[PDB]
Design an enzyme around this catalytic site. Structure first.
Site, PDB file in Angstrom:
ATOM      1  N   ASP A  53       0.950  -1.141  -0.186  1.00 47.54           N
ATOM      2  CA  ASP A  53      -0.125   0.281  -0.066  1.00 47.54           C
ATOM      3  C   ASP A  53       0.884   1.269  -0.079  1.00 47.54           C
ATOM      4  O   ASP A  53       1.806   1.275   1.103  1.00 47.54           O
ATOM      5  CB  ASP A  53      -0.949   0.069   1.208  1.00 47.54           C
ATOM      6  CG  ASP A  53      -1.872   1.044   1.054  1.00 47.54           C
ATOM      7  OD1 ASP A  53      -2.269   1.664   0.112  1.00 47.54           O
ATOM      8  OD2 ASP A  53      -2.076   1.952   2.456  1.00 47.54           O
ATOM      9  N   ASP A 100       1.262   4.891   0.334  1.00 50.24           N
ATOM     10  CA  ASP A 100       0.327   6.308   0.897  1.00 50.24           C
ATOM     11  C   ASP A 100       1.480   7.515   0.679  1.00 50.24           C
ATOM     12  O   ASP A 100       1.949   7.994   1.657  1.00 50.24           O
ATOM     13  CB  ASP A 100       0.158   6.293   2.319  1.00 50.24           C
ATOM     14  CG  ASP A 100      -0.879   5.005   2.529  1.00 50.24           C
ATOM     15  OD1 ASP A 100      -1.285   4.282   1.408  1.00 50.24           O
ATOM     16  OD2 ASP A 100      -1.454   4.808   3.555  1.00 50.24           O
ATOM     17  N   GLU A 145       1.622  11.228   0.516  1.00 49.76           N
ATOM     18  CA  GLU A 145       0.752  12.642   0.871  1.00 49.76           C
ATOM     19  C   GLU A 145       1.771  13.626   0.471  1.00 49.76           C
ATOM     20  O   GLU A 145       2.425  14.159   1.456  1.00 49.76           O
ATOM     21  CB  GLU A 145       0.445  12.377   2.218  1.00 49.76           C
ATOM     22  CG  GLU A 145       0.379  11.036   2.684  1.00 49.76           C
ATOM     23  CD  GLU A 145      -1.037  10.393   2.346  1.00 49.76           C
ATOM     24  OE1 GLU A 145      -1.943   9.941   3.399  1.00 49.76           O
ATOM     25  OE2 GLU A 145      -1.387  10.338   1.268  1.00 49.76           O
ATOM     26  N   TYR A 182     -11.511  11.900   4.402  1.00 47.45           N
ATOM     27  CA  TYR A 182     -11.397  12.544   5.722  1.00 47.45           C
ATOM     28  C   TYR A 182     -10.376  13.615   5.951  1.00 47.45           C
ATOM     29  O   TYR A 182      -9.860  13.673   4.617  1.00 47.45           O
ATOM     30  CB  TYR A 182     -11.245  11.568   6.760  1.00 47.45           C
ATOM     31  CG  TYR A 182     -10.359  10.268   6.318  1.00 47.45           C
ATOM     32  CD1 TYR A 182      -8.824  10.459   6.389  1.00 47.45           C
ATOM     33  CD2 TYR A 182     -10.795   8.929   6.154  1.00 47.45           C
ATOM     34  CE1 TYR A 182      -8.048   9.632   6.141  1.00 47.45           C
ATOM     35  CE2 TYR A 182      -9.747   8.004   5.840  1.00 47.45           C
ATOM     36  CZ  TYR A 182      -8.491   8.312   5.671  1.00 47.45           C
ATOM     37  OH  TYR A 182      -7.507   7.415   5.321  1.00 47.45           O
TER      38      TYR A 182
END
Length: 567
Positions: free
Chosen positions: A290, A292, A294, A370
């Protein structure tokens, strides 16, 4: 006949052996702490005190001969190699010219990172997590955090694993530039410094070796000589209980994303991709990777980093290159490996990546629906709302209007719907998108009635700063609170409001809040009602399913509402 050997247990490391060599009583560089061997080194001492010793020995696992050597005294150390993990009945015989004498059978442990030597994990799940038989094709993901074992006291056995399809383990850091980790404080940067000593830049490492494989968990039955402990061993035992459960390492995250910005140089990707392959061959309970990052293009924790022209193409190139790597592992092992990614869903984050291109190499996109609003500024809003809220100005929702200052909006509002719609507009298949659920609140203080433009809606107010609270209330960082904390200390049993807080729900946004009028405390989160709307929404558009962040902050209600929403 020689005297039948008797195994010296304590002199043979209690018959606990491993294909993976792990440093248990230190904290050093990753390469210094974890070595995976093709063949496990076996060292068994046996004794023959009375009678004759013979001249040769033979070692048997389950009746099959696995080793031979010489006996020269009343004490012999049998050193050999074996490349298959599991539990076996061991017998050592002693031989001379006239015959052999077998030892009594004794169980030898050979550990491997798939958990082939481990019994299924014994669960200790909060009964508030209800049983559901949701369609197996729908994904039900969550993030389990490495550091959750400390203050939060949440361990692998606490997870409601039968209500989950995917478990994302956060977070795997990347060695190299990591100034964002530094400004967080604590020990995170120090731990990363240590782990990266003697490790090439842009390679993956374990952040917390104590949490990962060192800590003895009595509930898991971890003894002193157990070759694999910590979260990782518990996740190995978990796969024995739930073989169809996907456990995927989450690389990066908010603060650990700095090295990703150098992925525009291909040699940095080559180094990374290869280390991820090595990590997957070393830790065999993992079922993919995964990513991620950012964020591609910037706007994350690194204020001085981000390339809106090059990061997107680099991200796509990375996904292709990871797929190629995973295909190699699929060929070598006969297993299915999954490539996933958690992504920002704000207009400015999505515009920097051609996701329709990137998603062809991927199984799932975890839409981080979110963190739309939070403590970083004093502007209230719904952090994880589905649609545009009542508080929003005209033309803010689609971005065709102007703000209170008079300047035009540069894009559509930060909502789940806007995020998903923009991704579908690019050409991303609906069945590859996973909608995100917040198991936490983001909060402010000082949002008192005198600051509201709408007396009924506190989201039209102005804050003084981040929400402040104790770890007993579930507040681990300023402006952030566990859902379980909101339930116990803001909502109460009846969901009407306790300790000065009042419950409110924006039906237009599908978003709840709790509000204390006197302190001005305002908390935006996901509740049962909003998760039902999200379950319906994902079902309505044919999305892959739902995922949550983070699992330890739930009391059961959120994941329950996730399954109920998809029904």
């Amino acid at each position: 006949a020689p005297t039948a050997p008797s195994i010296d247990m304590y002199g043979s490391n209690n018959l606990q052996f491993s294909k993976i060599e792990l440093a248990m009583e230190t904290t050093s560089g990753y390469n210094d702490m974890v070595k995976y061997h093709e063949l496990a080194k076996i060292k068994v001492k046996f004794n023959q005190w009375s009678g004759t010793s013979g001249d040769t020995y033979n070692v048997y696992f389950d009746g099959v001969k696995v080793a031979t050597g010489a006996i020269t005294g009343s004490q012999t150390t049998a050193s050999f190699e074996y490349g298959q993990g599991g539990l076996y009945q061991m017998e050592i015989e002693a031989c001379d010219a006239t015959g052999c004498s077998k030892s009594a059978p004794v169980e030898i442990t050979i550990a491997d990172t798939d958990g082939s030597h481990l019994k299924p994990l014994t669960m200790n799940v909060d009964p508030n997590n209800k049983s559901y038989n949701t369609d197996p094709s729908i994904v039900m993901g969550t993030y389990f955090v490495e550091w959750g074992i400390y203050g939060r006291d949440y361990t692998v056995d606490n997870m409601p694993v039968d209500n989950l399809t995917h478990i994302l383990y956060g977070f795997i850091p990347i060695c190299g530039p990591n100034e964002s980790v530094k400004s967080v404080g604590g020990n995170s940067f120090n731990a990363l410094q240590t782990a990266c000593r003697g490790v090439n830049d842009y390679e993956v490492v374990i952040h917390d070796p104590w949490a990962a494989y060192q800590k003895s968990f009595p509930q898991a039955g971890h003894e002193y000589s157990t070759p694999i402990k910590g979260n990782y061993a518990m996740l190995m035992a978990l796969k024995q209980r739930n073989p169809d459960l996907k456990i995927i390492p989450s690389i990066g995250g908010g603060t650990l994303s700095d090295p990703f910005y150098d992925f525009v140089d291909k040699k940095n990707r080559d180094t990374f991709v290869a280390s991820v392959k090595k990590f997957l061959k070393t830790w065999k309970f993992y079922d993919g990777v995964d990513i991620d990052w950012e964020f591609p293009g910037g706007g994350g924790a690194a204020a001085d980093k981000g390339d809106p022209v090059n990061d997107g193409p680099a991200y796509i190139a990375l996904m292709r290159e990871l797929r190629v790597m995973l295909d190699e592992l699929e060929a070598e092992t006969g297993r299915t490996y999954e490539l996933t990614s958690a992504i920002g869903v704000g207009y400015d984050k999505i515009e920097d990546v051609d996701y329709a291109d990137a998603v062809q190499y991927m199984d799932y996109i975890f839409a981080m629906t979110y963190d739309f609003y939070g403590g970083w500024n004093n502007v209230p809003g719904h952090q994880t709302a589905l649609y545009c809220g009542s508080f929003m100005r005209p033309g803010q929702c689609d971005g065709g209007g102007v703000d209170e200052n008079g300047e035009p909006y540069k894009g559509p509002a930060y909502t789940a719907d806007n995020g998903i719609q923009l991704l579908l507009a690019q050409g991303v298949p609906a069945n590859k998108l996973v909608l995100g659920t917040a198991m936490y609140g983001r909060g402010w203080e000082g949002v008192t009635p005198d600051t509201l433009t709408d007396p009924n809606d506190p989201m039209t107010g102005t804050a003084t700063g981040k929400l402040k609270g104790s770890t007993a209330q579930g507040v681990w960082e300023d402006g952030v609170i566990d859902y379980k904390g909101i339930k116990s200390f803001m909502l109460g049993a009846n969901n009407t409001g306790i300790n000065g807080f009042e419950y409110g729900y924006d039906a237009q946004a599908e978003a709840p809040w709790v509000w204390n009028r006197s302190t001005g405390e305002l908390i935006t989160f996901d509740d049962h009602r909003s998760v039902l709307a999200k379950g319906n929404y994902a079902k309505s558009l044919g999305l892959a399913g739902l995922f949550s962040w983070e699992i330890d902050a739930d009391n059961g209600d959120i994941l329950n509402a996730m399954h109920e929403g998809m029904a």
